[PDB]
């Protein structure tokens, strides 16, 4: 049975990768240091399975808490918990990029920054330092036991992350679940809810109660963490706690309906909570579903390096002007060079871009200012200076009037750009 040993090796390596991601999170997380859930830094380059063990332990902690808070369980609460435990989940990742090619390959911010792949980055510096969940791929959670059209919800924390929604139906053996965003434990008000009409028309008081900080027993910053085995139990127990605290008897009666439909259950779940699921490193699979929720805009297609949407939209040179401006404004030097290769730009094109008030960047900044703002566009600047499209020593007229590209280069501290401007 040689295949069995190969499966053993594969599971071992997957477990190793997950251990690496969780060790990164638990060791480089300062909120984990405030509480006593922090982990040691690996002396070796890799990390042992202790991190994974830690996850399990951490999970039990929170489970224990909520159990002790709501252990006396009513028949309604018990029936609702039984419903939630037997419910399966669809995990959704939205993007304005093309991550599917008969194979879905989603990657985390850390793996993207590692290979220097070009795409949009929604994680920020503070999330990386305080939580260090940037080696995880993020998903929103939906109830999967329904026959309705699959994208039931489209906004996570009142944010749309893209038109292309990728849905998977299988749990990950090493992913972890949080009742909210791990960094932002605040449930936004119903004013920003995607499905506000349901709760506003049918319920009364829960509208005010839902806006809260989902925290543990240690305090507000204590964000409960669960693992794949304890996801459903913790979610059900916290939902029961919230329903018991609430005073809108209509909301409680609707939640405790013994014959509740799955769409209403998903409404309640994504209203009271904003579940977030995390998978270590990268998710590569053949079992997925892609749903194009809407049409993508040119700037959004450029920020996500969606070459096919760009090729569909950039049909003429006025669209090439718009695309080049958006590429400069977003430091997308790859898209800028692709556009400079597809179309020929001259000083007349630069002038018509300067006359382009429909574009935000060309309305605010000069072309030279956009070329010299960040070093990430150096090559573009080179092409503009060496081919004669932009005159060095041109004094800015729109923003930072009187300055030149040399001043923006000084501000950027990029030695290559300053040197290139000094030599030309």
């Amino acid at each position: 049975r040689p295949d069995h040993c190969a499966n053993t090796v594969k599971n071992f390596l997957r477990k190793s990768i997950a251990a690496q991601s969780y060790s990164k999170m638990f060791s480089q997380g300062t909120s984990f240091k405030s509480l006593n859930l922090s982990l040691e830094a690996p002396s070796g380059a890799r990390s042992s399975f202790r991190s994974l063990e830690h996850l399990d332990k951490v999970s039990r902690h929170y489970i224990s808490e909520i159990i002790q808070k709501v252990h006396p369980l009513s028949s309604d609460e018990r029936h609702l918990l039984s419903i939630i435990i037997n419910s399966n989940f669809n995990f959704r990742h939205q993007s304005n990029s093309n991550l599917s090619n008969n194979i879905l390959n989603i990657k985390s911010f850390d793996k993207i920054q590692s290979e220097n792949i070009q795409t949009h980055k929604n994680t920020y510096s503070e999330d990386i330092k305080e939580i260090s969940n940037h080696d995880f791929v993020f998903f929103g959670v939906e109830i999967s036991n329904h026959q309705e059209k699959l994208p039931l919800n489209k906004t996570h924390h009142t944010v749309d992350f893209g038109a292309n929604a990728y849905i998977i139906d299988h749990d990950s053996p090493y992913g972890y679940m949080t009742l909210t965003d791990h960094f932002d434990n605040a449930i936004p008000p119903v004013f920003y809810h995607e499905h506000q009409s349901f709760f506003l028309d049918n319920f009364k008081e829960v509208v005010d109660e839902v806006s809260r900080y989902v925290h543990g027993n240690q305090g507000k910053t204590d964000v409960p963490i669960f693992n794949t085995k304890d996801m459903r139990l913790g979610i059900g127990l916290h939902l029961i706690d919230f329903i018991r605290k609430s005073k809108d008897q209509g909301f409680r009666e609707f939640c405790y309906n013994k014959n509740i439909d799955p769409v209403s259950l998903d409404r309640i779940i994504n209203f009271v909570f904003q579940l977030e699921y995390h998978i270590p490193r990268m998710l590569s699979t053949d079992n997925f579903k892609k749903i194009k929720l809407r049409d993508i805009s040119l700037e959004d297609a450029i920020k996500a390096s969606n070459y096919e949407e760009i090729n569909n939209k950039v049909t003429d040179k006025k669209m090439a002007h718009q695309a080049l401006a958006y590429s400069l404004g977003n430091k997308k030097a790859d898209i800028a060079l692709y556009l400079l290769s597809k179309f020929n730009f001259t000083k007349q094109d630069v002038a018509e871009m300067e006359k382009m008030k429909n574009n935000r960047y060309c309305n605010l900044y000069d072309v030279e200012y956009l070329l010299s703002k960040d070093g990430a566009n150096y090559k573009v600047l080179e092409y503009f200076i060496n081919n004669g499209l932009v005159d060095v020593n041109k004094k800015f007229q729109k923003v930072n009037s009187g300055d030149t590209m040399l001043d923006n280069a000084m501000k950027s501290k990029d030695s290559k750009m300053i040197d290139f401007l000094l030599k030309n």
Binding site: H157, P188, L364
Partner: protein, 237 residues
């Protein structure tokens, strides 16, 4: 509203601020926005805030000079250069929109961290006080700030000032917005609706009312150092 502008002028001639005639009127506005810092997180989405503020001010016949990513010494020099502009002696008001990471003392420069680089809020008032800047004496001087995270001489030398500070601890930590900042978005929104039937202070109070949502209730824009002896009425043309 043109008939109401003439009606409000005669009704309250010593209760509202004077308005220069559209001919020989050079109303200037300055926007100072720091979006990228050397040792601080970048304030992404400021492209929208600068745009929305430049349009609203230009719609009120204000010549907007946008300066971006300046250290504190440059911001001080830019404010002094904005006060020495001879085009203000032909004006009735001015607007200062400074948007950067800002501590309680003031707004921070790009290089600012152990090394300090902050433009003290009081320094802005000194540059435009009724002694150092006579071109804008007896003229309303609005100051709108978007920050993140004897002494009786000042009572008299600082006249005709109004501040509408926003100190939302966003710090790209709230990390929950849609193509811009809520404070600027609501400020433009209230200026579109209530600026024709209210004076400047009412518009600001109308913005503070918008932040009545449970999670956005403590996000109240704070009015500070109000030194206006008259009611400042902005007219839509």
């Amino acid at each position: 509203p043109h008939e109401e502008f003439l009606r409000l002028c005669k009704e309250r001639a010593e209760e509202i601020y004077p308005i220069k005639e559209r001919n020989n009127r050079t109303r200037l506005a300055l926007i100072i926005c720091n979006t990228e810092f050397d040792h601080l997180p970048p304030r992404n989405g400021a492209d929208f805030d600068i745009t929305g503020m430049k349009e609203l001010l230009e719609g009120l016949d204000y010549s907007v000079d946008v300066e971006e990513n300046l250290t504190a010494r440059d911001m001080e020099s830019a404010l002094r250069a904005f006060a020495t502009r001879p085009e203000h002696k032909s004006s009735d008001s001015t607007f200062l929109v400074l948007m950067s990471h800002g501590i309680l003392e003031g707004i921070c420069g790009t290089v600012h961290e152990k090394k300090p680089d902050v433009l003290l809020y009081d320094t802005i008032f000194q540059i435009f006080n009724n002694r150092n800047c006579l071109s804008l004496k007896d003229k309303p001087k609005v100051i709108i700030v978007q920050a993140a995270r004897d002494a009786v001489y000042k009572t008299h030398v600082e006249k005709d000032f109004i501040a509408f500070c926003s100190s939302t601890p966003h710090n790209v930590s709230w990390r929950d917005s849609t193509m811009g900042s809520i404070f600027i978005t609501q400020l433009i929104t209230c200026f579109q609706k209530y600026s024709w039937c209210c004076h400047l202070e009412e518009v600001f109070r109308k913005v503070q009312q918008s932040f009545e949502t449970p999670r956005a209730k403590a996000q109240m824009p704070t009015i500070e150092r109000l030194s206006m002896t008259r009611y400042f009425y902005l007219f839509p043309g």
